Design goal:
The complex is a heterotetramer of chains A (84), B (438), C (96) and D (59). With 84 residues, chain A is an alpha+beta fold. In chain A, 29% of the residues lie in helices and 13% in strands. Chain C has one domain (1-96): Orthogonal Bundle (Serum Albumin, Chain A, Domain 1), CATH 1.10.246.140. In chain C, helix 2 runs antiparallel to helix 5 (75-92) and helix 3 packs antiparallel against helix 4 (58-72). The chains are: A alpha+beta (84), B alpha+beta (438), C mainly alpha (96), D mainly alpha (59). The complex binds zinc ion (ZN) (7 copies). Chain A: This is SAGA complex subunit SGF73.
Chain lengths: 84, 438, 96, 59
């Protein structure tokens, strides 16, 4: 064990156990919402199964627009329903 | 303030535009719906150097390449192949490699999920006005109502409650549909005024619902329970009402603020652990007497105490040894609400307010306060303090809005204030929102 | 015969990800940086530099924030996390 | 040539720079949006002496 040691290769013992970004789309379609930094195994144990989660809740301001007719502030995903 | 002229050039062609938006929507979709390993190896591996996280990694708009920043490999690609736009795979923001800057000021790109409906959207809805964009506004007292308004401020700057309200969830399901009859509705009106253009009409309409039924904590429990009623009342049948009352409610309150405690009572003599219980909470009341740090109060809350209970005989073994009781968190909420118990009521009939300054962190770790552990970190976003005596006093809220800037709400007065000043508050309620879970 | 060092460094990073350990390292680091106030410090510094340089341009701004952001990382965090990476690398690599 | 030290420092630096770049991206983009959305953008008022509200006013 030595930080200064030249690395020869990967341990052969370890080795035993082993391109478009767009090609990810079909696995993503089958994959539920994922968080950068909230571990699912741990949200299963420590949090209520039906818990809401907003990761980095303050890292951007709330994305909304305001209805010109009635002044209501609408979440992006509420806008199309509110109009149509 | 200019706007990348290169993406403007692409938007002239109507077909090339829709390719850009379809792609932005796809990348962002993939980024929200890939498992860590997948993400690392397929959105943060560099096409050229094959390093993971060589700084930011950009997913090309026009092809499948991904290129790192620290070695200018996306820049190279943009120069070599002429593909000058990439999405940052940590955040889905779009970079122009000729401007050497992010394109953040184009609403259509920001709101790309609405691309198919854009001409409708952008003519029939406006961006929020400068004054209302962070919901900042005093709420006048008008009759010993700072315990109401200060609670309300933390609520209407709560990311979960804002999202819920602006999502129109309640509006589209409410049966009572009346600000003067229904609480959730009244709160909806306040969000309307503070974030849109309709600024006490909502808060006015909130005392009128209170006409139909001093401590800010009691009002917190009061108001969230009302919100929960309103949800129960909108439910389509008796069966769902039973569930939401007796089993698992799925309303905003019960999926944001509710945790549960394990209350373990064990008898030394024979380890009988039978008065052990799992009890819901919507906040935690901590003792602060002769304490100086929130973590000490949590240690207190969590430590084994002896139950002084005359003249107890272990149901199971007859031992007169005090039962050992310990509290631990069995399930944590997304927003943890802490009450420091400052208003000590006395057997002699009087009251005390404890003024002890309790130090509290901007990031709180609850890992040691659970029960059978990895880091479980919350971010302070709200504080309510009490000024004055038990008799005549007021309440003041403090909220951390987006960006990291803190404000102070003193009835009509709203005022900027530093994080360093907020931390020196004599805190009463503390609102912490879940931030990281290892 | 020697190996491509560039290609080896990549495979090493790849074993870290496959084993689960890259997520651990990454998460220990963020949790550490978050609790020492570094994220909030990096955000303040960015704002200061935007004010000073009267620019929101990412590249310009990054150039002045990044070098200082790295210095602000504490020794405890830097040391702790390097220890952790090192031990993970010992499981993976052979050494001449 | 590569050593345990070279590689570990590499990995730490990759992580740190990535994260720094993320934080800065979000701040500058947010501020770019705000300045473009509101050509007349006024920061909210600050007062050392605790007296002036977000628009430099009082009760
Ligand atoms: Zn409308
Ligand atoms: Zn450009
Ligand atoms: Zn590269
Ligand atoms: Zn390309
Ligand atoms: Zn209603
Ligand atoms: Zn409920
Ligand atoms: Zn017993």
């Amino acid at each position: 064990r030595s930080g200064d040691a030249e690395i020869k290769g990967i341990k052969p013992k370890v080795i035993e156990e082993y391109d478009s970004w767009k090609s990810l789309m079909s696995s993503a379609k089958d994959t539920p919402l994922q968080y950068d930094h909230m571990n699912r195994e741990s949200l299963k144990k420590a949090f209520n199964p039906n818990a809401q989660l907003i990761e980095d809740p303050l890292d951007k301001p709330i994305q909304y627009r305001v209805c010109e007719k009635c002044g209501k502030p609408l979440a992006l995903t509420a806008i199309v329903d509110h109009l149509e | 303030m200019s706007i990348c002229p290169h993406i403007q050039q692409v938007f002239q062609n109507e077909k090339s535009k829709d390719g850009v938006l379809k792609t932005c929507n796809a990348a962002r979709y993939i980024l929200n719906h890939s498992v860590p390993k997948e993400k690392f190896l397929n959105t943060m591996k560099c096409g050229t150097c094959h390093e993971i996280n060589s700084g930011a990694t950009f997913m090309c708009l026009q092809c499948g390449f991904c290129g790192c920043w620290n070695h200018s490999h996306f820049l190279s690609h943009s120069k070599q192949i002429g593909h000058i736009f990439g999405i940052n795979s940590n955040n889905g923001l779009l970079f122009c490699f000729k401007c050497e800057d992010y394109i953040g000021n184009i609403d259509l790109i920001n709101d790309a999920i609405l691309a198919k409906y854009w001409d409708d959207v952008c003519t029939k809805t406006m961006v929020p006005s400068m004054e209302r964009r962070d919901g900042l506004s005093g709420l006048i007292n008008m009759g010993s109502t700072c315990f109401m308004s200060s609670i309300l401020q933390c609520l209407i700057h709560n990311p979960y409650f804002i999202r819920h309200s602006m999502s129109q969830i309640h509006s589209n399901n409410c049966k009572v549909r009346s600000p003067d009859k229904c609480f959730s509705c009244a709160l909806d009106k306040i969000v309307h005024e503070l974030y849109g253009a309709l600024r006490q009409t909502g808060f006015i309409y909130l005392l009128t619902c209170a006409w139909k039924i001093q401590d800010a904590h009691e009002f917190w429990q009061f108001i969230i329970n009302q919100i929960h009623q309103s949800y129960v009342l909108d439910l389509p049948n008796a069966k769902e009402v039973s569930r939401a009352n007796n089993k698992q409610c799925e309303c905003i309150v019960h999926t944001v603020f509710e945790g549960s405690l394990e209350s373990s009572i064990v008898c030394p003599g024979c380890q009988n652990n039978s008065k052990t219980t799992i009890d819901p909470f919507l906040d935690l009341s901590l003792d602060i007497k002769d304490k100086k740090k929130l973590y000490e109060c949590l240690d207190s809350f969590h430590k084994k105490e002896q139950l002084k209970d005359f003249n107890y005989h272990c149901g199971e073994c007859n031992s007169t040894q005090d039962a050992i009781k310990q509290l631990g968190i069995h399930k944590l909420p997304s927003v943890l609400v802490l009450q420091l118990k400052r208003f000590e009521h006395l057997l002699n009939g009087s009251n005390r307010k404890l003024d002890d300054f309790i130090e509290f962190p901007t990031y709180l770790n609850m890992k040691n306060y659970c029960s059978t552990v990895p880091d479980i970190i919350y971010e302070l976003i709200g504080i309510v303090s009490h000024k004055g005596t038990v008799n005549e006093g007021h309440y003041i809220a403090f909220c951390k809005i987006s960006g990291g800037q803190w404000f102070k709400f003193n009835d009509s007065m709203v005022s900027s204030i530093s994080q360093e000043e907020v931390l020196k508050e004599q805190a009463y309620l503390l609102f912490y929102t879940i931030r990281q879970v290892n | 015969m020697t190996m491509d060092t560039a290609q080896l460094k990549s495979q090493i990073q790849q074993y870290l990800v496959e084993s689960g350990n890259y997520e651990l390292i990454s998460n220990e680091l963020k949790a550490r940086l978050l609790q020492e106030g570094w994220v909030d410090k990096v955000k303040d510094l960015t704002k200061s530099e935007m004010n000073i340089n009267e620019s929101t341009n990412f590249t310009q701004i990054l150039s002045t924030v990044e070098p200082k952001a790295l210095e602000m990382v504490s020794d405890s965090t830097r040391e702790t996390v390097l220890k952790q990476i090192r031990e993970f690398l010992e499981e993976i690599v052979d050494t001449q | 040539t590569i050593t345990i030290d070279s590689i570990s420092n590499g990995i730490l630096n990759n992580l740190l720079t990535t994260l720094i770049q993320d934080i800065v991206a979000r701040e500058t983009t947010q501020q770019q949006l705000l300045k473009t959305r509101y050509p007349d953008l006024r920061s909210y008022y600050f007062d050392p002496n605790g007296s002036l509200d977000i628009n430099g006013l009082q009760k």
